[PDB]
Design a protein around this ligand. Structure first.
Ligand SMILES: Cc1ccc2c(c1)[C@@H]1[C@H](CO2)CN2C(=O)CCN12
Length: 284
């Protein structure tokens, strides 16, 4: 069923809450035993948001290999994503260790450091060229190279140095700065523009490790980003773009991380983004 017609049928009937609860009921439940070990309590931002054991990213160290991060592997679309929480004061070094070890080119940030008057993640990148950051626990150095501030997003060029080997890599930081403190954006136009800027950079391409995507918990806004990207890629590959079922793609992604899409309003916004996405790239 063409999703644009499914959309108007749900809107006219006002059944968004009913559709959303059906997804919550059918979603996978897999063990997260490593996340719940007592040694890992200060590595989790939220007690109710944990990576599954089968899909968690492992840090390359013998001490403690745990980080709140999941590998989302989309077999038909041929895309992979790492979805993670906003870094905590004691996990900023783990975060950059993961970017290094997984060979990621891009980090996608969908939150502000402060929202609703409370801290939603650590200040984990340098704000001035001449004041670099050193992470002594993981032996990494991070330097701000350049910053491009636009109305709806900022892009940063960062240099990550493995102090152990003196190898360096260029990381691109894509910061979506205008998601509202409450609800979802009225139009998906600026979110879509942002998504196609991340693509144009190479950060989502198979010649690099998976993109790292985060918000505060790494399930709601983060879920919206990967769901829109994968659905638009499937519409480009298939003989019948009308066969793409957004609810079935979301349930496949929920095999790899719990809770993706946190509200019925985020589910409706994801439909709106894909639908408009299709028109721009398939109509005109
Ligand atoms: C669906 C959509 C919306 C916006 C948008 C794109 C796609 C992106 C980039 C422009 O922003 C450039 N681009 C094209 O010219 C073809 C499509 N793709």
């Amino acid at each position: 069923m063409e999703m644009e017609k499914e959309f108007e049928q749900i809107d006219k009937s006002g059944s968004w809450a009913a559709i959303y609860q059906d997804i919550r009921h059918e979603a996978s439940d897999f063990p997260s035993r490593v996340a719940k070990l007592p040694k890992n309590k200060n590595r989790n931002r939220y007690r109710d948001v944990s990576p599954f054991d089968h899909s968690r990213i492992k840090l390359h160290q013998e001490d403690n290999d745990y980080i709140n991060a999941s590998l989302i592997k989309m077999e038909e679309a041929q895309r992979s994503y790492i979805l993670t929480q906003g870094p905590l004061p004691n996990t900023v070094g783990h975060f950059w260790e993961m970017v290094w070890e997984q060979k990621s080119r891009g980090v996608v940030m969908l939150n502000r450091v402060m929202e609703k008057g409370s801290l939603k993640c650590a200040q984990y990148w340098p704000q001035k060229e001449e004041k670099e950051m050193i992470f002594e626990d993981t032996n990494l150095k991070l330097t701000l190279i350049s910053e491009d501030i636009k109305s709806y997003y900022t892009v940063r060029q960062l240099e990550l140095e493995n102090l152990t080997t003196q190898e360096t890599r260029e990381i691109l930081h894509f910061h979506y700065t205008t998601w509202p403190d409450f609800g979802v954006p009225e139009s998906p136009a600026s979110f879509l523009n942002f998504l196609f800027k991340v693509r144009e950079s190479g950060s989502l391409s198979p010649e690099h490790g998976p993109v790292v995507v985060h918000c505060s918990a790494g399930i709601g806004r983060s879920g919206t980003f990967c769901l829109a990207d994968t659905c638009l890629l499937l519409m480009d590959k298939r003989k019948d773009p009308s066969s793409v079922d957004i609810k079935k793609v979301l349930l496949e992604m929920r095999k790899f991380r719990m809770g993706l899409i946190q509200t019925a309003d985020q589910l409706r916004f994801s439909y709106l983004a894909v639908i408009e996405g299709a028109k721009f790239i398939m109509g005109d």
